[PDB]
Each structure stands twice: as structure tokens, then as C-alpha cells.
Amino acid sequence: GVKVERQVFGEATKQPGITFIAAKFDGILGMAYPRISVNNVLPVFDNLMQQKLVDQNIFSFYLSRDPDAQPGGELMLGGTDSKYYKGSLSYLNVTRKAYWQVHLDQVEVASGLTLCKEGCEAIVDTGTSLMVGPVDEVRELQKAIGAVPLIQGEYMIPCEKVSTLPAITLKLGGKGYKLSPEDYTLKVSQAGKTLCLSGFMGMDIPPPSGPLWILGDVFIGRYYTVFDRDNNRVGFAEAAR
Amino acid sequence: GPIPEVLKNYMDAQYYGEIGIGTPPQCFTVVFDTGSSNLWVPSIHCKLLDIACWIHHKYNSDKSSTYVKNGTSFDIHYGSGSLSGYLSQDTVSVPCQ
Ligand SMILES: *[C@@H]1O[C@H](CO)[C@@H](O[C@@H]2O[C@H](CO)[C@@H](O[C@@H]3O[C@H](CO)[C@@H](O)[C@H](O)[C@@H]3O)[C@H](O)[C@H]2NC(C)=O)[C@H](O)[C@H]1NC(C)=O
Ligand SMILES: CC(C)[C@@H]1NC(=O)C[C@H](O)[C@H](Cc2ccccc2)NC(=O)CCCCCCCCCCCNC1=O
Ligand SMILES: *[C@@H]1O[C@H](CO)[C@@H](O[C@@H]2O[C@H](CO)[C@@H](O)[C@H](O)[C@H]2NC(C)=O)[C@H](O)[C@H]1NC(C)=O
Ligand SMILES: O=[P-]([O-])[O-]
């Protein structure tokens, strides 16, 4: 393990609404750039780098997409873990050093609909479960695959239709990253019932930060992800499957 | 060399691992979030109104020999919700043990 000394952090005393009540986790450890740290607090990984506690100033995520798999995932601080990806890493430069933001070339539904047609900006966010895009573009995507609205920009798809949905491909750095219907849909359970959630959510993020697509856990699950602060880049490789 | 931090997966919607804060380490589960830049955990001094705090682990600065007071107020607004509290300083262990 590692011990990061002299880390400034928040002691939470109010948590309004319901977000944190049924959450499995106690808190959040942010790993983006210092530019978006509240109160300009030096982040954990920044403190780790200044204390020379790793040789390579990179960190990497494997996220399992079988909800019952053990292990559930792995964060590797200061390296990559070959156990969890196949083939070579492909890299994209960070475009605004605040979130882990990169340029997205396009989003293509196999049946023909193209979103983000002339390129757009996206962030790579382990802390968002779903893919996120602009409300109007996501609405079009969902109509293309036959999903129907649930609430707050989420959509559902009949589980028996999933296997015949089209693939969706994101183009990043001129290479295609395919998501199968199994990759971009999730099982959800409440009160003994199973439904299939569309893994794209519509949300408009206003300027000046937005608009932004979000490559969430849906994407990072399929594509093992490396976050590199030495070279200000993001790397992707096909995760173990 | 590199440090592995194993994560749990709840329902393909929450991924979280164990960290320590303090000496000796007090363990907490956290999301390792590439979409934000602050670390926080619940305080033992959380308000009685904070229902989430009732059923999560709470940090007690009195039990840590490396705690250094700060006390500055903070408020963080995420896409999914918000929180507030005060800042403190301590040693963070990854993993907890
Ligand atoms: C992605 O980001 C990296 C790092 O910012 C970019 O690398 C940089 O590329 C330029 C060429 O366009 C390099 O230029 C040269 O710099 C030296 C000074 O060291 C100078 O002598 C030359 O006249 C020239 O300007 C720069 O060194 C290079 N940096 C590194 C670390 O290799 C890269 O171009 C970006 N990739 C894309 C696709 O934009
Ligand atoms: C920098 C920080 C202050 C903050 N960062 C996040 O909200 C993203 C984080 O990845 C956050 C982490 C989190 C995980 C679990 C429980 C609560 C929060 N994810 C979400 O809340 C999910 C939805 C995000 C939608 C895009 C954000 C759109 C902008 C929101 C307003 C400005 N606030 C931010 O950008
Ligand atoms: C609370 O913590 C912040 C840091 O997160 C402290 O501010 C830093 O303090 C030292 C001086 O002691 C400076 O070298 C840093 O440059 C400061 N950074 C920033 C961004 O302000 C602050 O002093 C602390 N406050 C209290 C009351 O303890
Ligand atoms: O799944 P466990 O963190 O309750």
C-alpha cells in the first residue's frame, strides 16, 4: 500500500436529498485535475506525485461488467495491470485539463444515425455509471434503438429486444470503439422485477464547461482505461472478456 | 512499485474501494472519481438531519494521532447531489490495510 501524508479532505456534515442514503460507499475520492478542486485543495493523486510515492504518475481502471464477478474492479495506482486487458493501449491527448476531457470524433449507431457529427468534447468519468450526451441527440439515439423514456433523461428497453439492437461505435483518435447491446445496456432489479436500462442518459451540461458527452462506466467497463498525468493523456485497451 | 486497489461492483452502477484515514487508519469505502477532485468522508460531527450519516462510516479526528485541524467550510455540488462540511488534514492509506 501507500500512505499519502498531509492530505486535506472534507468531513461531511450535511448531505441533503437522497443521493448518499442508500449508496454502498461512504465517500468520494476525486482523481481529476486540481483546476476543479473545491476550495483549491490539493488532490490525493497530486499529493501522491509530490511525495514521489509512485515511479509513473499514471493510474488505471478495470471495471467488471458482470455485476456478480469477483473482483468487481481494480484501480492500479502508478501503473497498468495486464491481467485485465488484451492488446496494446491507444492514447488521446487531454484537451482541457480540468476533467479528464478528450475530443470525441463521432458517435455512430450501426443502423445509420450519426451523433456528434463534426466532433465534440467528452470527459472520461469513472464516477458516472452511464454514458451521457446532450438531451436532443440522446433522444434520437434512443428512438433509433427502440428505447422508451423512464425519468430524468433515462430510458428502458424491453429485455427480450436487447440481443437484436444495433451496435454503437464511438470514434476516438480516429479509431472505432464498439459497444455491443450487451455492453450498452444494464440489468436493473427492484422488488423482484428485472428490467433493462439503456446505458445512454440525456443531460445538457451548460457552458462554459459544456456541452460534454460522458464516457462513464459503460465505456470504461469494455475499455480498460489509463489516466496519465506525466503526459496528459488517456489510454484505452480492450478489457478482459 | 504500482499499488493495486481492488474494487467492489454493486449492480454495475457503483464501484468502490477501501481507504484509510488517520493513525491508526479508520476505514471508509469511496468512489475513485475521475470526474471530481476532492476527497471527503462523513464526519462523526455530522448533523442529526443527515440521514445518510446514520448508516455510513464516520471519521473521528479525536482517535487519530496524525490529524491536523483546518476547519474551513466547504460545499460541493455534483450532478447527482450535494454536500457540505469542513476541511481537515490527515494521512490517507490506500488500501486501508
Ligand atoms: C499530444 O500532446 C503532446 C504533449 O503536449 C504533444 O507533443 C508535442 O508535439 C510537438 C510537435 O507538434 C513537439 O514539438 C517540438 O518541441 C521541441 C521542444 O522540446 C522543439 O525543439 C521543436 O521545435 C518542436 O516544437 C513537442 O515537443 C511534443 N512534446 C512531447 C512531450 O513529445 C503531441 O503533439 C500531442 N498530440 C497531438 C495528436 O496533438
Ligand atoms: C467537479 C465536481 C464538483 C462535480 N463532478 C461531478 O458531478 C461528476 C462526478 O463524476 C460525480 C461523482 C459522484 C459519484 C457518486 C455520487 C455522487 C457524485 N458524478 C455524478 O454526479 C454523476 C452525474 C454527473 C453528470 C455530469 C456533471 C455535470 C456538472 C455538474 C456540476 C458541476 N460539478 C461537477 O462537475
Ligand atoms: C486549510 O487547508 C488549506 C490547503 O488546502 C490551507 O491553504 C494552504 O496553506 C499553506 C500555508 O500554510 C500554503 O502553502 C498553501 O499554498 C495553501 N493553499 C491554498 C490553496 O490556499 C489553509 O491554510 C488551511 N487553513 C487552515 C485555517 O488551517
Ligand atoms: O456489497 P457490500 O459493500 O455490502
* DSSP state letter for A70: S
| C-alpha closest to that of A241 among A190, A157, A183 | A183
Tell me which chain A residue has its CA closest to the CA of residue B28.
A26
Contact status, residue A162 vs residue A190, Cβ threshold 8 Å: no
Residue owning grid cell 455512430: A108
- Tell me if A3 and B38 make a contact (CB, 8 A cut-off): no
Q: Report d(CA B62, CA B26) in Å as an integer.
A: 11
Residues 6+ positions from A181 with CB-CB distance below 8 Å: A145, A162, A163, A164, A165, A166, A167
- Three cell numbers, residue A114: 450519426
CA distances, A107 to each of A91, A142, A207, B64 (Å): 18, 13, 21, 50
Q: Report d(CA B5, CA A240) in Å as an integer.
A: 18
H or E stretch at A50: helix A44-50
Using CA atoms of A195, A171, A126, A19 in order, give the dihedral in degrees to the nearest 10.
-50
Sorted by where each begins, the domain ranges of chain A are: 1-241
Residue owning grid cell 440489468: A187
Ligand 3 site-directed mutation target among B37, B61, B70, B74, most atoms within 8 Å of CB: B70
Contact status, residue B90 vs residue B17, Cβ threshold 8 Å: no
CATH number of the domain at A1-241, please? Answer: 2.40.70.10
Residues 6+ positions from B3 with CB-CB distance below 8 Å: A1, A2, A54, A76, A77, A78, B94
CATH assignment of the domain containing B49: 2.40.70.10
Give the structural domain span for B26.
Answer: 1-97
Other residues' Cβ atoms within 10 Å of the Cβ of residue A74? 20
Radius of gyration for chain B, computed over Cα atoms and rounded to the nearest angstrom = 14
Contact status, residue A142 vs residue A198, Cβ threshold 8 Å: yes
Contact status, residue A111 vs residue A85, Cβ threshold 8 Å: no
- Chain A nearest-CA distance from B64, in A, is 13
* DSSP state letter for A143: H
Other residues' Cβ atoms within 10 Å of the Cβ of residue A13? 19
Residue owning grid cell 442514503: A21
Q: B6 burial class (0-12, 13-18, 19+ CB within 10 angstroms)? A: middle
- Chain B nearest-CA distance from A68, in A, is 8
Enumerate the active-site residues of B. Answer: 33
In angstroms, what is the span from residue A227 Cα to ligand 1's centroid? Answer: 19
Exposure on the CB side of residue A18, measured as CA atoms within 13 A: 1
| C-alpha closest to that of A221 among A209, A239, A200, A195 | A239
CA distances, A93 to each of A60, A101, A184, A232 (Å): 16, 8, 25, 6
Domains in chain B: how many in total? 1
Helices (H), A102-224: 135-145, 181-184, 217-222
Q: Which of B6, B37, B49, B87 should be substituted to probe chain A, the one whose Cβ sees the most A Cβ atoms within 10 Å?
A: B37
Residues 6+ positions from A207 with CB-CB distance below 8 Å: none
CA distances, B97 to each of A47, B17, B25, B74 (Å): 20, 12, 8, 29
CA distances, A112 to each of A161, A180, A216, B57 (Å): 19, 15, 23, 49
Give SS3 for A11: strand
Contact status, residue A64 vs residue A71, Cβ threshold 8 Å: yes
Contact status, residue B36 vs residue B21, Cβ threshold 8 Å: no
Query: Position A98: which residue type?
Result: A
In angstroms, what is the span from residue A193 Cα to ligand 4's centroid? Answer: 21
Residues 6+ positions from A151 with CB-CB distance below 8 Å: none
